């Protein structure tokens, strides 16, 4: 198995998810117009958040420790049992909070209390989201790129079917329910694929508790908590700088670039958690880690550069196809943003190493480094060049950050502190 082969599997599953999303999104737009989209905005962002929140963000830890103990049946059972207990316990608590506060949640999502029933349904749907993501994380711990990809592919296709039936039957609220069911229905193929492929015995998923492993998986919950604040906060007051001296139109230009660039990043690095994270988890010697990091960088940097150069050449086609034609000056932002994306992908290789070593301390330092760099560059370039400056600030940020990652890796590999 290799990073290249994992990318081949993961690209096929990600492309189907993108094609399915574009199909469902245009069906929702044609059916309910801008009024339906504006009312679905918060609800859709909640569905995204639940993809990590429903299982308490332990998923990367599940992959890390399953990989570490994939040849240790006794510990592997303990890992999966504790992970099952943590996902079951938190998802159950989440379901109770959702059903009990369905009225305040509906008010915050839609502006009134008329959606309490949909919120109460989501309280049960998020259980499928959490459990499905756990099963996928288990497969990634075994580096089963094919099982992971086939599961996501089946889930996307059945998700489109479920969305069609749901909105045809129940109108707008049925459509929203279908949106929540898209990531939840993956649990059906994921459970089937995991058992049929012989990855682990079904009994491993019975909830158990191990205090040690629970504390270790909690470290990945804490990284998930940190990640959901730092850089999101950074982009929020980046938009603040933008609106302070420019129009909302320029703000929209930048937000469109960032959101589509983030989706581009998620597609390109989706195989990192499938291959890179479990592989680096098993390796402990510095020579072996360096070899794998070097080999990964030698593959991913030319691949992403070639892909990003192609995208920049077709930036006008990418804008016309992927986004609503309400803004077409972002083309000048593509070059800067795409360069930053290439170096950010390179920086992800070091970031997944930190995940693979469960280093909470290096995770904090990596996150704070990105936040501060983003702020120094944004505070400089945004007030002078608007959305173009925001793209320049993003690019400059990850030029410096990738270089910093290399230097810190060299100091760590050479044991500068010993």
């Amino acid at each position, epitope marked *: 198995v290799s990073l290249a082969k994992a990318s081949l599997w993961t690209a096929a599953s990600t492309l189907v998810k993108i094609g399915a999303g574009l199909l469902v999104g245009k069906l929702l737009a044609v059916s309910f117009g801008p*009024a339906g989209l504006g009312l679905a905005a918060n609800f859709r962002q909640l569905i995204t958040v639940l993809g990590v929140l429903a299982g308490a963000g332990i998923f990367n830890g599940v992959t890390k420790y399953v990989a570490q103990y994939h040849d240790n049946p006794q510990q592997l059972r303990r890992v999966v049992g504790t992970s099952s207990a943590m996902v079951l316990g938190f998802s159950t608590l989440m379901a109770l909070v959702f059903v009990l506060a369905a009225a305040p949640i509906s008010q915050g999502l839609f502006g009134n209390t*008329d959606y309490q029933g949909l919120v109460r349904l989501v309280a049960l749907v998020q259980m499928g989201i959490a459990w499905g993501n756990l099963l996928l994380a288990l497969m990634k711990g075994f580096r089963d790129a094919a099982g992971n990809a086939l599961s996501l592919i089946v889930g996307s296709l059945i998700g489109v079917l479920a969305y069609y039936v749901s909105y*045809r*039957l*129940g109108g707008y609220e049925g459509a929203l329910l279908g949106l929540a069911l898209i990531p939840a229905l993956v649990v059906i193929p994921a459970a089937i694929m995991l058992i049929k492929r012989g990855v682990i015995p079904l009994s491993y998923l019975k909830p158990s508790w191990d205090n040690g492993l629970a504390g270790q998986l909690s470290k990945f919950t804490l990284m998930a908590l940190i990640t959901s604040v730092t850089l999101p906060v950074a982009y929020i007051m980046m938009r603040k700088l933008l609106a302070a001296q420019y129009s909302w139109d320029e703000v929209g230009i930048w937000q469109g670039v960032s959101s589509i660039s983030d989706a581009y990043l998620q597609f390109i690095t989706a195989s990192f958690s499938v291959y890179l994270l479990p592989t680096l988890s098993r390796l402990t010697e510095k020579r072996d880690i360096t070899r794998e990091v070097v080999k990964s960088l030698k593959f991913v940097l030319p691949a992403v550069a070639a892909a990003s150069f192609t995208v920049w050449l077709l930036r006008d086609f990418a804008i016309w196809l992927l986004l609503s034609n309400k803004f077409t000056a972002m083309r000048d932002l593509f070059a800067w943003q795409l360069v930053g994306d290439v170096l950010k992908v390179g920086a992800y290789v070091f970031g997944y190493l930190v995940i693979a070593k469960a280093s909470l301390r290096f995770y904090i330092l990596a996150e704070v480094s990105q936040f501060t760099l983003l702020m120094v560059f944004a505070h400089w370039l945004i007030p002078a060049h608007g959305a173009l400056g925001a793209a320049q600030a993003y690019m400059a940020t990850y030029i410096v950050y990738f270089s910093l990652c290399c230097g810190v890796f060299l100091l760590w590999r050479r044991r500068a502190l010993e």
Partner: nanobody, 125 residues
């Protein structure tokens, strides 16, 4: 887009007539409905008239007692309420939405109507 008229304090057993006016242009394509919300509960379905064949739907609590009608000439809809019992005391609101928002069996869900009126009070002594 929607304004309500009628209602108030009525003696139990007496009749009452609510009316709702709509602005805009395209009105015959909007499904029209009445909802009510009593103090302490949530918005519940009352009655609904379609945009096409003039079909009607009623909650089991008002069937036979309440009758909804529409007039596409003046873009208004009405609700006649006979045999008013104390359980009918609520704020009554008219709602408008397109048939794609209701689907096949979602015509009773208030979240399928994005356009609402201010609401008129009905108190059955």
């Amino acid at each position: 887009q929607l304004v309500e008229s009628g209602g108030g304090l009525v003696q139990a057993g007496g009749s009452l007539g609510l009316s709702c006016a709509a602005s805009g242009r395209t009105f015959s394509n909007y499904v029209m409905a009445w909802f009510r919300q009593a103090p302490g509960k949530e918005r519940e379905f009352v009655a609904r008239i379609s945009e096409s064949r003039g079909t009607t739907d009623y909650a089991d609590s008002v069937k036979g007692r309440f009758t909804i009608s529409r007039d596409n000439a003046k873009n208004t809809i009405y609700l006649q309420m006979n045999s008013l019992n104390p359980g009918d005391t609520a704020v009554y609101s008219c709602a408008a939405t397109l048939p794609a928002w209701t689907g096949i069996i979602g015509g009773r869900r208030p979240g399928n109507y994005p356009y609402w009126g201010q609401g008129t009070q009905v108190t059955v002594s």
